[PDB]
């Protein structure tokens, strides 16, 4: 009882949202190199037996819609859920191609009480995005 | 007979709260590069938190920014593991 049950018929879904091109208003430049990340993740999770679904350049509205729809699927035969977000961001925020979305709005769809087929199962959100504008200058070792 | 609605979530952030996250135009982001590498090498054995800890070390020790703009040069990064998990997670099962 110390380890999550991972022997369901399916390991689960791995949703990858890969945002590279943004609208000028955001002031965010093209996220060069993100396609490498998306391909790497796809292969990595495919090897772990996850059902990978890659989505490119989604608006904030589309991100929410995708998340809502995915959370409404029947995950009964899935051991877990994985969502990878690749985009620009700020603390507590992820960027759609046209603007910010609160991360809480995205993760809320999967709450133990809002996605019953995932209750008690690990829900992983992997987030490659900035969380502010501070730099870590490091310290010599 | 009940569990918190916030339980069983794991947020693997690429960087610490309030900080920038680094991405290389040719090789991809430092965090994703490291995450995939550690999963490929250790997912058949190590528990997830331990894999993510190795990711933290890899990003922290093997990467440092290089930029013609001194303002963005020689910077470092540490990922941030946020766990509300209630059990150990292994990406395999023992038949």
């Amino acid at each position: 009882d110390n380890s999550y049950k991972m022997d369901y018929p399916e390991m689960g879904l791995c949703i990858i949202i890969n945002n590279k091109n943004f609208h000028k208003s955001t002031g965010m430049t093209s996220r060069s190199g993100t396609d490498v990340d998306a391909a790497n993740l796809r292969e990595t999770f495919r090897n772990l037996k996850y059902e990978v679904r890659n989505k490119n350049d989604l608006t904030r509205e589309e991100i929410v819609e995708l998340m809502r729809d995915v959370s409404k699927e029947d995950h009964s035969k899935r051991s877990s859920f994985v969502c990878v977000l690749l985009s620009h961001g700020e603390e507590g925020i992820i960027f759609g191609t046209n603007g910010p979305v609160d991360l809480k709005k995205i993760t809320n769809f999967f709450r133990g009480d809002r996605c019953r087929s995932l209750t008690g199962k690990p829900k992983l959100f992997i987030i490659q995005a900035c969380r502010g504008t501070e730099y870590d200058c490091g310290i010599e070792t | 007979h009940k569990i918190p609605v916030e339980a069983d979530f794991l947020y693997a952030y690429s960087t610490a709260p309030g900080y920038y996250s680094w991405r290389n135009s040719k090789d991809g982001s430092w965090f994703i590069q490291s995450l995939c590498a550690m999963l490929k090498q250790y997912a058949d054995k190590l528990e997830f938190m331990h894999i993510l800890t190795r990711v933290n070390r890899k990003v922290a020790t093997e990467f440092e920014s290089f930029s013609f703009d001194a303002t963005f040069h020689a910077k470092k990064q540490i990922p941030c593991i946020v766990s509300m998990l209630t059990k150990e997670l292994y990406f395999y099962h023992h038949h």
């Binding site: 996220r31 490659q128 | 920038y20 680094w22 991405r23 135009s25 290089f66 930029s67």
Partner: peptide, 4 residues
């Protein structure tokens, strides 16, 4: 190297 670019930021994000």
């Amino acid at each position: 190297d670019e930021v994000x």
